[PDB]
Amino acid sequence: ATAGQEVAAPATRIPLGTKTLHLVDASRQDPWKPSAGNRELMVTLWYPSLPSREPAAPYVSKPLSRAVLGNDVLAGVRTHAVAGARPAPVPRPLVVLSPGFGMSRITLTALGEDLASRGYAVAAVDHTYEAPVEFPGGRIEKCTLCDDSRMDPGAVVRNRAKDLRFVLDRLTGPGSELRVDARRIGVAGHSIGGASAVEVMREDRRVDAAINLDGNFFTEPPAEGLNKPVLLLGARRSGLPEPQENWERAWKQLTGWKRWLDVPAGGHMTFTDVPWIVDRFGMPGQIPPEQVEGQLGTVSAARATAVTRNYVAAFFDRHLRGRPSPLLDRPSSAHPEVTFMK
């Protein structure tokens, strides 16, 4: 089932390293479970490394695979990054990634490694109690907010902005486990993570550019405007009134570089590893039949991964590395699934 199985091949064959970091923000009590203490976060780094002959890191542990999928099969999948490999010479521009609500940061692995293979330092962030998360010493915390109807998505976005600013403090500061080019920082995220990517850019002058991968906004638009680059990349919003109006309200206060793309035949999960997880390793009725259209659409796992990687890389190459791309400006015959809403 998993013998020799891997995540989608990244853009290049450069050596990649990976590290997992346990960060504790001791200035803030945890917003959802303050009895547990201060706000802690788990982060996965992917980065260009020196060559290593060690095997690549697994996608996930067996216990966390059980928590995410319902069985351990994903623990047999290998990535393309070597745990603890020494970083390559020059500090690289940093892209920070935030997952969808209830979803592990591991669901952005194919994207993260791909950006790393293109020459970026990448940090995927877990937001505790908003996903199953594995901490050091085998401690797995549950998505306790997933159960709770008292969850406010605006509160989640506002707190995630604080989480992400703290991650930037740690990765750009003197004690960092990975030296990055702090002059060039991008943030992207899936669903509520995408709303949070834009939110942190509003709050933090160090963030240069942001991508929202199909998240509704849950905070009111800035009255002063947001003049920094934003890509809105959604799924099925061409024929969904509520998602379209949500993004139209945000669009009016985006005062700088901006694009709004749609994947009309995609699904909400198109911008993550979930299509690949479900299509290759999913149980019978992993996503129930009535939700398949909305969550996955008809875009294959391979195309979902390719489209997301290519457009995300195009955006960050444009704003962080001075490289143009026609993908951001006009229809692409190599990506017939992508349309322009503006």
CB of 149 to Na ion, least distance (A): 15
Residue 151: C-alpha distances to residues 108, 155, 284, 321 (Å): 23, 8, 30, 38
Span near Na ion by CB under 5 A; candidates 46-54, 67-75, 94-102, 275-283: 94-102
CB of 102 to Na ion, least distance (A): 6
Give the sheet arrangement for strand 82-83, strand by strand. Answer: 82-83, 16-29, 38-48, 121-127, 92-98, 180-190, 209-213, 230-235, 258-263, 339-340
Residue from 18, 49, 79, 191 touching Na ion (CB under 5 A): that is 191
Which lies closer to Na ion via its Cβ, residue 191 or residue 310? 191
Q: Are 209 and 315 in contact (CB under 8 A)?
A: yes
Which lies closer to Na ion via its Cβ, residue 101 or residue 260? 101
Which lies closer to Na ion via its Cβ, residue 102 or residue 256? 102
CB of 305 to Na ion, least distance (A): 19
Q: Per CB under 5 A, which of residues 254..293 are in contact with Na ion? A: none
Alpha helices in 173-262 (DSSP H): 192-203, 241-252
Find all residues with CB under 8 Å of 208, minimum gap 6, and list them: 184, 185, 186, 228, 229, 319, 320
**Number of amino acids touching Na ion (CB under 5 A):** 3
Span near Na ion by CB under 5 A; candidates 2-10, 17-25, 191-199, 305-313: 191-199
Cα(164)–Cα(41) distance, integer angstroms: 10
Q: Are 116 and 94 in contact (CB under 8 A)?
A: no
Which lies closer to Na ion via its Cβ, residue 79 or residue 272? 272
Cα(254)–Cα(257) distance, integer angstroms: 8
CB of 134 to Na ion, least distance (A): 20
* 191-196-201 Cα angle (round to 5): 135
Decide: is 107 part of the binding site for Na ion (CB under 5 A): no
> How many residues comprise the chain?
342
Span near Na ion by CB under 5 A; candidates 8-16, 186-194, 204-212, 230-238: 186-194
Angle of helix 109-117 relative to helix 301-320, nearest 10 degrees? 50
Which lies closer to Na ion via its Cβ, residue 84 or residue 154? 154
CB atoms closer than 10 angstroms to residue 116: 28
Which lies closer to Na ion via its Cβ, residue 119 or residue 193? 193
Span near Na ion by CB under 5 A; candidates 98-106, 198-206, 285-293, 299-307: 98-106
Tokens for 244? Answer: 């379209």
Site string for Na ion, 109-148 (x = CB under 5 A): ----------------------------------------
Span near Na ion by CB under 5 A; candidates 61-69, 96-104, 143-151, 179-187: 96-104
Which lies closer to Na ion via its Cβ, residue 218 or residue 257? 218
Cα(129)–Cα(104) distance, integer angstroms: 10
Decide: is 100 part of the binding site for Na ion (CB under 5 A): yes
Decide: is 101 part of the binding site for Na ion (CB under 5 A): yes
Q: What residues line the site for Na ion (CB under 5 A)?
A: 100-101, 191
